[PDB]
Amino acid sequence: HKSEVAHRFKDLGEENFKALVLIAFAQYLQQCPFEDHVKLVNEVTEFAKTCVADESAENCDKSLHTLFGDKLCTVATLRETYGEMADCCAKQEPERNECFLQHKDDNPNLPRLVRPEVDVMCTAFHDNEETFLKKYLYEIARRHPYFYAPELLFFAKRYKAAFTECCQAADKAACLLPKLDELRDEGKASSAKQRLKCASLQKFGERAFKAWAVARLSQRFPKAEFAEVSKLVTDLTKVHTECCHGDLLECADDRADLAKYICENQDSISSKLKECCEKPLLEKSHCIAEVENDEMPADLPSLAADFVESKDVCKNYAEAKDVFLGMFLYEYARRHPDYSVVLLLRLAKTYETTLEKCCAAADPHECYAKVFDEFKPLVEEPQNLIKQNCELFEQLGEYKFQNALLVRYTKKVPQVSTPTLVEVSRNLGKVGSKCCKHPEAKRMPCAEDYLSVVLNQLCVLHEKTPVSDRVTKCCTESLVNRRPCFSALEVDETYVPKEFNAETFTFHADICTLSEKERQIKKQTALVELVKHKPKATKEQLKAVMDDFAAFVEKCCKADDKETCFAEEGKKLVAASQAALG
Ligand SMILES: CCCCCCCCCCCCCC(=O)OC[C@@H](O)COP(=O)(O)OCC[N+](C)(C)C
Numbered sequence: 001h002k003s004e005v006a007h008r009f010k011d012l013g014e015e016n017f018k019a020l021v022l023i024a025f026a027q028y029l030q031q032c033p034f035e036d037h038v039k040l041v042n043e044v045t046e047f048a049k050t051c052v053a054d055e056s057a058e059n060c061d062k063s064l065h066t067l068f069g070d071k072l073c074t075v076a077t078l079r080e081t082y083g084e085m086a087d088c089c090a091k092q093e094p095e096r097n098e099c100f101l102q103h104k105d106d107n108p109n110l111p112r113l114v115r116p117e118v119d120v121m122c123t124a125f126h127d128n129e130e131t132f133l134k135k136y137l138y139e140i141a142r143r144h145p146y147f148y149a150p151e152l153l154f155f156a157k158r159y160k161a162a163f164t165e166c167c168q169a170a171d172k173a174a175c176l177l178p179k180l181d182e183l184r185d186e187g188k189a190s191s192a193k194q195r196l197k198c199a200s201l202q203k204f205g206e207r208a209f210k211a212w213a214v215a216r217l218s219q220r221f222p223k224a225e226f227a228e229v230s231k232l233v234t235d236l237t238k239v240h241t242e243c244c245h246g247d248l249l250e251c252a253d254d255r256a257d258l259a260k261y262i263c264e265n266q267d268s269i270s271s272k273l274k275e276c277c278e279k280p281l282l283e284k285s286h287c288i289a290e291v292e293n294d295e296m297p298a299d300l301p302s303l304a305a306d307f308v309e310s311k312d313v314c315k316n317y318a319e320a321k322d323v324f325l326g327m328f329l330y331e332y333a334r335r336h337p338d339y340s341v342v343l344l345l346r347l348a349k350t351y352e353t354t355l356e357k358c359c360a361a362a363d364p365h366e367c368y369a370k371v372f373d374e375f376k377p378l379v380e381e382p383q384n385l386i387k388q389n390c391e392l393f394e395q396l397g398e399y400k401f402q403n404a405l406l407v408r409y410t411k412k413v414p415q416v417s418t419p420t421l422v423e424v425s426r427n428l429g430k431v432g433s434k435c436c437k438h439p440e441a442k443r444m445p446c447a448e449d450y451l452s453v454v455l456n457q458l459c460v461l462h463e464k465t466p467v468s469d470r471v472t473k474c475c476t477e478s479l480v481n482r483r484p485c486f487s488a489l490e491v492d493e494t495y496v497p498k499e500f501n502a503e504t505f506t507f508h509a510d511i512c513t514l515s516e517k518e519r520q521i522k523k524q525t526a527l528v529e530l531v532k533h534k535p536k537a538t539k540e541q542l543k544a545v546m547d548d549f550a551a552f553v554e555k556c557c558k559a560d561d562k563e564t565c566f567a568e569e570g571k572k573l574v575a576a577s578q579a580a581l582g
């Protein structure tokens with residue numbers, strides 16, 4: 001109201017306010033050191049309490065943008081370090097923040113963050129909790145200027161629980177390390193989803209995003225009326241449009257408004273919200289975004305009575321094409337939360353193609369009469385892929401399932417770099433382990449979720465250093481045909497086997513003494529290289545070599561004087577294997 005800075009402080013609480021201010025600043029002045037930022041926070045934090053005490057103290061009435069920009073233009077070395085960015089300081093408000101927004105750098109040349117020894121962390125944690133966690137909150141925000149501030153903070157608090165528990169378990173690493181790895185993965189999937197959404201929204205336009213939302217909102221709020229889902233689609237689209245654009249405050253107000261609109265109408269939306277709706281403003285929309293689907297209305301009819309039988313199908317359709325198609329997505333989606341969102345859209349695109357071609361022909365009813373039959377194939381291709389992958393995944397276990405994917409893809413696209421094949425087969429291996437333990441009912445949404453980030457990462461890496469037109473064809477295809485396209489890739493027939501190279505297949509004892517999450521990578525690395533050198537090798541001829549290599553690794557690691565065995569026995573594979581596939 002009179003003072004936006006005080007209202008934020010009374011609303012957030014000192015701790016949250018302090019952490020969000022650090023992130024906000026870390027995201028713009030990425031080259032300042034941690035101690036400069038702790039300095040700002042405290043100055044901004046003391047200034048805010050001035051305002052909390054009396055909303056009429058000087059400057060307390062300025063807008064957050066104006067205050068944030070002024071502080072920003074205060075940094076003495078702004079020009080020295082940021083060049084162009086400092087010229088933003090010569091502008092008037094609306095333009096000035098827009099100017100700062102553009103000079104934000106997604107790829108700063110900062111050194112990767114090296115996870116210290118569990119022991120050094122716990123000790124740092126115990127001796128200086130605040131600085132330990134704040135320093136790392138800073139290191140993460142400066143490296144991710146677009147990661148939405150409050151979610152970044154929701155991750156920070158989970159890193160805090162992780163340390164507070166594990167750092168007294170005596171067998172610390174067993175506790176902490178798995179928790180940290182589970183966190184990095186989420187952190188990465190969340191970040192990659194955000195970019196995915198923003199890039200899709202511009203690569204494919206507002207309509208395709210609204211169709212995606214209708215589907216998603218309907219599985220999620222199946223008892224809501226189509227008019228309520230549409231109102232929520234409209235708002236969800238401004239939110240994402242404004243959050244993609246990047247301005248943290250406008251993005252935060254849009255999300256809060258939506259959340260408060262959702263909580264003021266729970267009855268009209270979902271019976272699952274009462275818990276998310278009583279939480280602090282800071283956590284509200286995030287919680288809602290995470291909510292479990294509401295139980296569907298039990299007895300619901302076939303969509304047949306409104307989309308194929310009833311006269312006026314072409315009439316209600318012509319009248320407002322998208323609204324009608326939206327209703328069909330709504331009715332279909334809400335009946336199927338077992339479906340992935342993109343499947344739902346495959347069906348919508350199918351019905352749309354069919355009403356078009358048909359409504360403008362002899363007998364509408366007798367052209368489009370057989371539309372629901374076209375859904376069946378579409379609905380099982382992914383269903384089957386899940387029955388087979390989760391079953392293959394139970395015979396072999398995680399790591400061998402990863403290896404089976406490794407051989408599959410390498411053959412489909414041998415041109416891809418080994419590090420990319422290895423990291424992709426590994427992550428796709430992790431998606432099976434996750435999603436597969438799930439019941440048939442929640443499996444497809446699970447894999448869609450994860451596959452799209454994996455596939456976009458693979459595409460990005462590929463975009464820079466393009467190496468296969470086919471990957472490229474699948475990568476610049478409709479967001480809906482992406483996975484079907486990759487699943488369509490067949491063994492590459494034109495590929496000429498790679499020139500053999502001994503170095504690549506030579507091993508040493510270091511690997512008897514290397515860690516699991518590191519031994520596997522070299523094994524997986526050589527496996528790929530193996531396939532690339534003898535693509536025609538068969539399931540049996542490969543297993544024979546893989547079994548030899550495992551008896552070759554064991555002999556030179558077990559009951560032996562080691563080292564010399566590896567070059568001796570080693571050359572007795574590179575040539576024995578080389579002829580059992582020659
Ligand atoms: C995210 C907020 C944490 C506060 C910063 C200090 C405490 C956090 C604990 C640090 C984790 C130590 C292990 C480690 O550093 O691994 C990952 C590093 O490569 C940095 O990346 P992550 O922090 O895993 O990912 C950033 C979190 N994201 C993905 C949500 C941005």
Ligand SMILES: CCCCCCCCCCCCCC(=O)OC[C@@H](O)COP(=O)(O)OCC[N+](C)(C)C
Pocket residue numbers: 203204205207208210211214230233234322323325326329345348349352477478479480
């Ligand atoms: C006011 C709010 C109301 C919401 C109603 C909007 C819903 C209408 C949806 C029509 C949906 C038909 C299904 C479908 O067409 O989805 C297509 C998208 O997934 C598009 O992916 P892209 O290749 O980027 O889009 C360009 C090509 N499309 C959009 C024509 C398929």
Ligand SMILES: CCCCCCCCCCCCCC(=O)OC[C@@H](O)COP(=O)(O)OCC[N+](C)(C)C
Pocket residue numbers: 005008012020021024043044047064067068071149150248249251252253254255256257259281282283284285286
């Ligand atoms: C010495 C004078 C210095 C003046 C500096 C003070 C003004 C600068 C203020 C910068 C604004 C960034 C920090 C802040 O005040 O809050 C911004 C974020 O916390 C907004 O997030 P919230 O509104 O908590 O949204 C979280 C809930 N949502 C996401 C569902 C909306």
Ligand SMILES: CCCCCCCCCCCCCC(=O)OC[C@@H](O)COP(=O)(O)OCC[N+](C)(C)C
Pocket residue numbers: 190191193194197216217220236239240255258259262285286288289290
């Ligand atoms: C997890 C990301 C995709 C899931 C689909 C988003 C549909 C979720 C619907 C929540 C319905 C109410 C939305 C809400 O009230 O939140 C406003 C939002 O911005 C919530 O964000 P979402 O689009 O759910 O995604 C969270 C942000 N991410 C996903 C881009 C990281």
Ligand SMILES: CCCCCCCCCCCCCC(=O)OC[C@@H](O)COP(=O)(O)OCC[N+](C)(C)C
Pocket residue numbers: 340342343382383385386389390409413416421424428431432435444447448451452455458479480481482483484486487
């Ligand atoms: C470089 C390597 C090449 C890449 C190969 C991509 C192939 C991955 C196919 C993965 C199969 C194992 C995962 C699984 O459990 O499958 C689930 C799917 O088959 C079903 O997902 P869908 O509903 O089709 O998800 C939508 C597909 N989109 C969103 C990616 C277009």
Ligand SMILES: CCCCCCCCCCCCCC(=O)OC[C@@H](O)COP(=O)(O)OCC[N+](C)(C)C
Pocket residue numbers: 403505523524526527530533545546549550551553554573574575577578
């Ligand atoms: C053309 C020239 C041929 C040269 C021969 C090199 C071929 C080797 C390349 C890949 C090797 C096979 C990769 C693989 O499948 O990993 C083997 C693992 O499944 C098991 O191997 P080991 O570590 O010996 O067994 C222990 C299993 N662990 C992991 C539980 C310890």
